[PDB]
Amino acid sequence: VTLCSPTEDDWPGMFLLAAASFTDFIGPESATAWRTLVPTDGAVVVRDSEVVGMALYMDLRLTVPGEVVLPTAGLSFVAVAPTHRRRGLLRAMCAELHRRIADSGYPVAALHASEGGIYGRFGYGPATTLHELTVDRRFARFHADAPGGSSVRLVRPTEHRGEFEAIYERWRQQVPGGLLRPQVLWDELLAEAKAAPGGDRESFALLHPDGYALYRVDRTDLKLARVSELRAVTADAHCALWRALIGLDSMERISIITHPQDPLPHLLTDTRLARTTWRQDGLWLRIMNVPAALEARGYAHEVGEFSTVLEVSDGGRFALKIGDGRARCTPTDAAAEIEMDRDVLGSLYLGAHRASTLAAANRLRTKDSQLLRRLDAAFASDVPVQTAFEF
Amino acid sequence: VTLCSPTEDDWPGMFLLAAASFTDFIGPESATAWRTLVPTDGAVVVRDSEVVGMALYMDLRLTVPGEVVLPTAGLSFVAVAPTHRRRGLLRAMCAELHRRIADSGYPVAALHASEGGIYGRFGYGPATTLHELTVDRRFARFHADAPGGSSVRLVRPTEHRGEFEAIYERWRQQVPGGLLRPQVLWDELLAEAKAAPGGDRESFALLHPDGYALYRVDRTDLKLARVSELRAVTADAHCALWRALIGLDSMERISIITHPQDPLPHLLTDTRLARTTWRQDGLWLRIMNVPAALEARGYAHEVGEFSTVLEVSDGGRFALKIGDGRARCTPTDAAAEIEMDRDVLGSLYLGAHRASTLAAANRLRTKDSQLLRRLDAAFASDVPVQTAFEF
Amino acid sequence: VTLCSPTEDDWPGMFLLAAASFTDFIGPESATAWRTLVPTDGAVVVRDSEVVGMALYMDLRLTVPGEVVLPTAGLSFVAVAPTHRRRGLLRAMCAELHRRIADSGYPVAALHASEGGIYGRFGYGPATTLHELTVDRRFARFHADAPGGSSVRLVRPTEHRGEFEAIYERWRQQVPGGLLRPQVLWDELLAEAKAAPGGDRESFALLHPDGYALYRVDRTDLKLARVSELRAVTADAHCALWRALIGLDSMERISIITHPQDPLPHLLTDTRLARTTWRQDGLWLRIMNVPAALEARGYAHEVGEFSTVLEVSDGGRFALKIGDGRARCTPTDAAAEIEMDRDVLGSLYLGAHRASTLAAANRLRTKDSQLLRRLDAAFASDVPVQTAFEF
Amino acid sequence: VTLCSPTEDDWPGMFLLAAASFTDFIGPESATAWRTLVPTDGAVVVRDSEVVGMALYMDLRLTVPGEVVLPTAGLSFVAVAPTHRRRGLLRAMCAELHRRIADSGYPVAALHASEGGIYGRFGYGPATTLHELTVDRRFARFHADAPGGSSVRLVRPTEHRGEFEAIYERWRQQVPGGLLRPQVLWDELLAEAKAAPGGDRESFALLHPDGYALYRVDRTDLKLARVSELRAVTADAHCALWRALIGLDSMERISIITHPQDPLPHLLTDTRLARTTWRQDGLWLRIMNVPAALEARGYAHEVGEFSTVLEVSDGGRFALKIGDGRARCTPTDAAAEIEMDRDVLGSLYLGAHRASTLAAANRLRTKDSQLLRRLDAAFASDVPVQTAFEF
Ligand SMILES: [Cl-]
Ligand SMILES: [Cl-]
Ligand SMILES: [Cl-]
Ligand SMILES: [Cl-]
């Protein structure tokens, strides 16, 4: 058992481990495309010789509150062979990548979790919430107040790549959780848009000047349309796209994986028709550099200037001053007023979780209820946090 | 078709309509107990002579943000005979009760909705959110940070009525959505605690000095425990009760109908184990007197003093000034800065829905994005809004 | 093994065999009430001493085409002990009862079959068709042409016995398949109308001057109302009762066991909403006396006078002359033009099955296609055949 | 929004709308084959430029009672874009095609309905009934009377095209509902006979001189054989094919979409084994020219000569004289004795629905019960109405 950066000769062994580890493995051709987002020294492997462990990160750009874009290490392709469980391989690989990520100057790392119980101990907190809405469209009537009572076109996704790219680029820059989508991921997305023999049905697009929806009929439930992606830059675009989706008269149900503040239910005369059928953690964040991350994002202007001392468990103690929507975060040995593990700060960082809620679980410790209210207000995001694409 | 306050002789006919209308009808004996909460002139019936329509309200006490308790008209027992649909009987009965409620001096009316599409047009907005969590307790491990790593007793509910009453009374006064639970509803609750032949299994209680949980094994799924009610006045009590529930080793799953900010998931090493299995509107509010309701509740201290002009569609136009956690709301003919239907104000009132989200659906109209942020912040509740008991 | 008429002392042993044989056994008290319809010498038992076989008939009145009422032997309570299978006990009991029924002067015997494969060989043919319609009432809109766009009352069944009795008596006299419902069966029907602990929910009635519907919410599916019985003497009553049933706004679905010519689907803008969810043989007929049965019923006036020779396999050969809606059926040794087993004549007798369809299965043999068309037309019923009550 | 006959350049846009509208879309290659049945000016499109609406008709030959073959406009490929709902596009397209169909000299139009609630208002009535029978073949025993107690061969469909074509041509000419099946539809049918990767299993044929059955094992239920098509010209062929299907010893169940008068159940000792698992409207008819359609079909010889006056709502009033199996239908201003909407006449026309049943729903209005009986008898079909192939 040695831990190394993989050579070109290691990648066939990594693809075997991937195929055996991930039921959703994209195959070697697609994986080779995703590889283009992994920097030199972005990957580690454990050899016994065959590959028994692997982990890597990709260079991402993540939007945080205040429309600030952070360089982000996106952890992915993490696997330990079923032959090598309970040997500390995950711990060793995560320790090495975190060392490389921190030394490289990334203020944050991010991942999507295979299970909810693994990444908390490595300092990752769930930072976005996936919210599945299922609409019984047979009953759906738009409210008198709903915009645009057409601006929308039914199109083939592959024929309107430029328009989707431009709309997505506008969306990702204005929404916390937004990720830059590089050209290789557009190539991959539009390749998946076509039907597969015994696989997915053909994808269609609804295109508005200021939004698009990509959807396909479910493989097995032929009365369910699944929206894979809806990106709307305006309220008018969001409503117009939903009027078109409710117009899919051959379907009983439209489902979408969205965010908790999706205004869809409020567009209907019966809010209950937009049923929450599933909820899960989306993007997870590890704050690598506490002061750099905390100084980088914008804060709520509504809360008056306040100062506190924040201790992150084995992450430093800082004088934190928040006023006029900006934070200053400097080293101190002054007594801590707030204490939390690193994972908890990740959960607060995009505004998806309230300091008050985490305090009620004793994940966040303070003796000052006023300070808790100020933190809740300051860390809150004006623009609701969304999830961009899984990686 | 005439609309009257019912005489004693009308109640057998009302109980027949109830039995035929409500699959969960509590029967004449329990209904006669609930009747004690209906004031003189609190009920209307339509006769054709037999009862073809009915509606009533009960005298309730509702806690709103700032621990303020409002007299509240709780609409209930609303039915139109299947023989008399589409004759405007619901509209006529709701118009008459609203007249009586407004003239009686109630600032707010409330109900639980049989369907989501009916009460919006009568000025009711959904004001609390029911959130069902299902825990696979076989996997549940408490976080190192979780309080109290016993203070809890397994007891017969009927033997500890005084302790439940006292804990509930503390809870309902400190939580927005809290309702006073009169003696007749305690009588009814503890009568339901015993097992029924071919019906519900026996209810048990977990009792802490500062909280209780009432639960029973599901009728048909013998590996599911359903928590009917958990009232905790402290974080220590909430965690202690959940440690005890996760200790129900004969169960696979524990389910509870709770609120979106329940800290349960954060008590576990795997937040994903507390799965959201169901979400629905809970309590609905109709603001009867806009200035009385808006002046009565407390507002967030974090937001700086601001002034605006609010128009409620056919509900008046008001100069609204919010500062130091209090509102002043006076008549004006000045140009409106914010417009919304009455139902929308109900949805904002307990802090369950953000002004920003309702604005994105065009249910709330303003040209000022700064004003929207200030409203979001001001109307937000420090203590998360919960649902008390169904009526 | 001896075959006897039971003594009073035999009935406890018959009730044990019944409980072990019939999952729907009505119990000794209800069975003692049904006993009042069994004539002296109407029952046989086989003893080994304990009861190992039983069979009986009740005195019924069956309506046949032309509003003619026939005395009918209703076979029921037929059981062989699981200890005594394949010993010819059913054959022996059926042979003896048929001897008694024939000698008593009954022209027809009838039964409801536990299985479809048993009674054909004893000369019983399925004579009515049960047709279950399930309406998704959330979508149901009445056609512009539908009558009565209220005459209907929601009532407690036990309070309107006289009105149900009178409506049913009018119905049973005008519909082929109609049975006289004696007072003991009204006593039993209204006793079942009340709810049972862990059993059926409360029954309700919709009452029109010229029709009624008895319905209850399903035990387990709380969004399904099951109509146990709808008797309408006019088209106006039938439509009015269905308008009321579609008005059960708490239900998703209304189901009824009806007949294939129920006009319900044609009352709706979408005929497809009245879905056929189940179909089965209803009443079975054994023609005991061929000439008496054939001379007794009315025939279609549309078909011109014709003569043929009918042979029933081991049931006689007859010169059959049909004209002006009446048949003459006299002994002959002339060559047969039509041959069929006795069971086939039972299937033709109420007009539920076409001679042409049975001929296509070679259950009915003729070389004359014109004769087949004349038989189809003559045996057809003006009033569609319905099923009264199970016995 | 303009309505035009499509140019060659419009068909890619029509195929996109088809793919997005029809989950069973046959793809561009098969659709191009079906196109060969669409006459010049047989198609309309709405452009906004992209295709947002389309509809066409094909030249068909439909068999009606009396073995009469009518030129028939088969409406198909009808779609409105989900972006253009509730804009009257369907009404506009149907009005234009009906104008073209009427002017072209078609006496009838026909379609298969995506939903049951749409085509009634455009004058289409459901005219055939689809009846799914599922046989539990493990229990199925043929009756002593059943023919042919082998004449049948198990063959590859593609190797016996000539024999299937010849049998089908005999069938379609003798059965009301029969359609001529052109060479392009035989090409398409035999292409679907082969297995597809992750798709349908291989089709097999059972071939008799006077009948064939095409069947395949269900994709997912490997104990279910689905008969896609059984065409039998004789009772012997029908029974022989069913003996062979019941001989599929690896199956639990055989299912077929047949007609209500299928004699299959009567071939078995247990009629109940042939269970009706599904029922739906099949072919829909719009009578374009009332007198031409009514004079064209044969009527029952059994009913004596009679005269009446029929009014079709906005379809004319006619003196209708029916005798010796023929109708004369001439213009009159004499008082109407029968009134009905055009859709109702379509439902009566192939004998699938009784005038009496439609009268009970008030879809057919007369004050003369004798006239109703005569219409029932006259419009009845000697040969039961069947459904040919979906289009
Ligand atoms: Cl999202
Ligand atoms: Cl709650
Ligand atoms: Cl019936
Ligand atoms: Cl058919």
Swiss-Prot record, chains A, B, C, D:
Protein name: N-acetyltransferase Eis
Enzyme nomenclature, EC number: 2.3.1.-
Active site: Y119 (proton donor), F391 (proton acceptor)
Membership in a protein family: Belongs to the acetyltransferase Eis family.
A Pfam match: SCP2_2
Subunit structure: Homohexamer; trimer of dimers.
GO terms, biological process: aminoglycoside antibiotic catabolic process; biological process involved in interaction with host; effector-mediated defense to host-produced reactive oxygen species; response to antibiotic; symbiont-mediated perturbation of host inflammatory response; symbiont-mediated perturbation of host innate immune response; symbiont-mediated perturbation of host programmed cell death; symbiont-mediated suppression of host programmed cell death
Subcellular location: Secreted; Host cytoplasmic vesicle, Host phagosome; Extracellular vesicle, Bacterial extracellular vesicle; Host extracellular space
Swiss-Prot/TrEMBL domain comment: The Eis monomer consists of three regions that are assembled into a heart-shaped molecule. This shape is formed by an unusual fusion of two general control non-derepressible 5 (GCN5)-related N-acetyltransferase (GNAT) regions and a C-terminal region. The N-acetyltransferase domain of Eis is responsible for its modulation of ROS generation and pro-inflammatory responses in macrophages.
Gene expressing this chain: eis
